[PDB]
Amino acid sequence: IHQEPFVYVKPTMSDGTCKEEFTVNGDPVKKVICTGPNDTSPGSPRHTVPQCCYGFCVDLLIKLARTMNFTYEVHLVADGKFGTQERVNNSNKKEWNGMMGELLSGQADMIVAPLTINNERAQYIEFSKPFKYQ
Amino acid sequence: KINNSTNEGMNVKKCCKGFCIDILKKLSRTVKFTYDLYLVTNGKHGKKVNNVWNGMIGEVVYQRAVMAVGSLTINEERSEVVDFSVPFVETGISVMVSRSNGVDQVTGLSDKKFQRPHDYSPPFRFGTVPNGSTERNIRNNYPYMHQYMTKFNQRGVEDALVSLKTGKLDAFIYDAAVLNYKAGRDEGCKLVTIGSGYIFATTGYGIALQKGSPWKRQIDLALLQFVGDGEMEELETLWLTGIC
Amino acid sequence: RLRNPSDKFIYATVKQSSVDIYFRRQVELSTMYRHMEKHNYESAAEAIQAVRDNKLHAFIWDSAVLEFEASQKCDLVTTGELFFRSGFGIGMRKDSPWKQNVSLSILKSHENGFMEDLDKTWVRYQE
């Protein structure tokens, strides 16, 4: 999902290009080409364009890809929710959404996001040792 | 053991308490298992001496025991031999100095003091517990630091604490949670902690299980639930005291 | 005043959040659950802008994120207490060979100073 300090989202400059901006420390900014909706469903009926994503989680994932040999394909969650177990309004059929919904459906292989480690979500999926403390 | 000439010994029965023992009692309340607590006579936590471990690692790898509720450090070589559950307390490593007497001080492991004690006019000294877990971190990250720490070695945890109070030691390196409690009850509060686990490991405390233990799913469910309902918070109040 | 809130202290969080679930688990914190349900925003940026316009009065959020935000903007002020000491994890599928070496890599990065460089890049940076 779009994390304010960890995942920076930028539209392409002219056509599918990311401006190779640098930091103030001589370190090039490493971005990734990401595909996701432009606005919400009420706002954007259907507007998904390849954009440029970078930040903290992107650096972590790129370090991971550097460590072990495997490619990846980034996309975005259709809405802006982590994921809740909500039963159908009338059918009362429990269901997940957001990142958890897209991961349970099989469309997602690995969620790399500032996830909140908790028992309810650990009951359905697995975790690695925490990288963060806060 | 009775004497040093013979290896015969006696199973003296004592009473145990503390903070981690509170965890073990509450675990049997939910999982409803049984235990036969005892103490390691071999020695410290674990050290692979020519592919031979000792202490708790020697008791779970060799499967003479099952688990170890005692405090243990999470690293690579210990994660190879056994499996850890989820951690519950946020503890790093830190350096203790009597900053309080009668600013920048040690900025951290990157401080210029850890480049050469001769770089500064007063030749300081700082060591750790011999055959300890943190000693491995120094060797893996800075072998030169181990060479400097070779002449700054000490014997006892409180012995170094005495040395810092008396002035026989300048700085000392040990875990955060242990050194935080000793500084929360100390009279005078001459010794001062450095940072908040900022330039340090920022790891956790875990329970060593035999590899592939079926208890692993049940144990982790309770531990996350234990921190998920505020019960873990009260135990910190009971066994931790932060003044000022 | 937060235990029995009113129309003055406007506090909420992101709709359908793990913070909302955390409040829901607390059977003794149903009042805040019933209060924030009428003001939950879509994203944290909505809360940032609304409180920037002095329309909100409190907002539950993460620690390091708000530290960086207060570094960027001086008007952003946080509280003093530090609660719910947990960690962030990598959302994974069920048991698969993409679990062992991943956690081992995370540990090997935590033991050395690569996380320090990541902090220098994004978290440690200030204004």
Swiss-Prot record, chain A:
Coiled coil feature spans: none
Description of post-translational modifications: NMDA is probably regulated by C-terminal phosphorylation of an isoform of GRIN1 by PKC. Its phosphorylated state is influenced by the formation of the NMDAR-PPP2CB complex and the NMDAR channel activity.
Residues carrying covalently attached carbohydrate according to the record: N38, N69, N89
Subcellular location field: Cell membrane; Postsynaptic cell membrane; Postsynaptic density membrane; Synaptic cell membrane
Disruption phenotype: Mutant mice are born at the expected Mendelian rate, appear grossly normal and have apparently normal brain structure, but the pups do not feed and all die during the first day after birth. Cerebellum granule cells and hippocampus pyramidal neurons from mutants lack NMDA-induced Ca(2+)influx and membrane currents, contrary to wild-type.
Binding site for glycine: P114, T116, R121
Tissue occurrence: Detected in brain (at protein level). Detected in brain.
SS bonds (residue pairs): C18-C52, C34-C53
Function: Component of N-methyl-D-aspartate (NMDA) receptors (NMDARs) that function as heterotetrameric, ligand-gated cation channels with high calcium permeability and voltage-dependent block by Mg(2+). NMDARs participate in synaptic plasticity for learning and memory formation by contributing to the long-term potentiation (LTP). Channel activation requires binding of the neurotransmitter L-glutamate to the GluN2 subunit, glycine or D-serine binding to the GluN1 subunit, plus membrane depolarization to eliminate channel inhibition by Mg(2+).
Protein family: Belongs to the glutamate-gated ion channel (TC 1.A.10.1) family. NR1/GRIN1 subfamily.
Record's comment describing the protein's domains: A hydrophobic region that gives rise to the prediction of a transmembrane span does not cross the membrane, but is part of a discontinuously helical region that dips into the membrane and is probably part of the pore and of the selectivity filter.
Protein name: Glutamate receptor ionotropic, NMDA 1
Full-sequence range covered: 403 to 536 of 938
Swiss-Prot record, chain B:
Binding residue positions for L-glutamate: S71, T73, R78, S133, T134, D175
Effect of loss of the gene: Mutant mice appear grossly normal and are fertile. NMDA channel currents are decreased in mutant brain slices. Contrary to wild-type, where tetanic stimulation leads to a strong long-term increase in synaptic strength, only modest long-term synaptic potentiation is seen in mutant mice. Mossy fiber granule cells from mutant mice present a decrease of the slow component of the excitatory postsynaptic current. The slow component of the excitatory postsynaptic current is nearly abolished in mossy fiber cells from mice lacking both Grin2a and Grin2c.
Extracellular side: 103-244
Disulfide pairings: C189-C244
Tissue expression notes: Detected in striatum. Detected in forbrain. Detected in cerebellum (at protein level). Detected in brain cortex, piriform cortex, hippocampus, caudate-putamen, dentate gyrus and granule cell layer.
Sugar-modified residues: N3, N4, N101, N131
Intracellular or extracellular location(s): Cell projection, Dendritic spine; Cell membrane; Synapse; Postsynaptic cell membrane
Domain observations: Contains an N-terminal domain, a ligand-binding domain and a transmembrane domain. Agonist binding to the extracellular ligand-binding domains triggers channel gating.
Similarity comment: Belongs to the glutamate-gated ion channel (TC 1.A.10.1) family. NR2A/GRIN2A subfamily.
Function: Component of N-methyl-D-aspartate (NMDA) receptors (NMDARs) that function as heterotetrameric, ligand-gated cation channels with high calcium permeability and voltage-dependent block by Mg(2+). NMDARs participate in synaptic plasticity for learning and memory formation by contributing to the slow phase of excitatory postsynaptic current, long-term synaptic potentiation, and learning.
UniProt name for this protein: Glutamate receptor ionotropic, NMDA 2A
Organism: Mus musculus (Mouse)
Protein's gene: Grin2a
From Swiss-Prot, chain C:
Coiled coil: none
Protein origin, superkingdom: Eukaryota
Cellular compartments annotated: Cell membrane; Postsynaptic cell membrane; Postsynaptic density membrane; Synaptic cell membrane
Knockout-associated phenotype: Mutant mice are born at the expected Mendelian rate, appear grossly normal and have apparently normal brain structure, but the pups do not feed and all die during the first day after birth. Cerebellum granule cells and hippocampus pyramidal neurons from mutants lack NMDA-induced Ca(2+)influx and membrane currents, contrary to wild-type.
Glycosylation sites: N4, N101
Residues annotated to bind glycine: S18, D62
Reported modifications of this chain: NMDA is probably regulated by C-terminal phosphorylation of an isoform of GRIN1 by PKC. Its phosphorylated state is influenced by the formation of the NMDAR-PPP2CB complex and the NMDAR channel activity.
Membrane-side (Extracellular) residue stretches: 1-127
Tissue and organ expression note: Detected in brain (at protein level). Detected in brain.
Domain notes: A hydrophobic region that gives rise to the prediction of a transmembrane span does not cross the membrane, but is part of a discontinuously helical region that dips into the membrane and is probably part of the pore and of the selectivity filter. The extracellular N-terminal domain (NTD) is a site of allosteric regulation to modulate overall receptor function.
Subunit description: Heterotetramer; the NMDAR subunits are modular and harbor tiered domains that function in concert to regulate opening and closing of the cation-selective ion channel pore. Forms heterotetrameric channels composed of two GluN1/zeta subunits (GRIN1), and two identical GluN2/epsilon subunits (GRIN2A, GRIN2B, GRIN2C or GRIN2D) or GluN3 subunits (GRIN3A or GRIN3B) (in vitro). Can also form heterotetrameric channels that contain at least two GluN1 subunits and at least two different GluN2 subunits (or a combination of one GluN2 and one GluN3 subunits) (in vitro).
Gene name of the record: Grin1
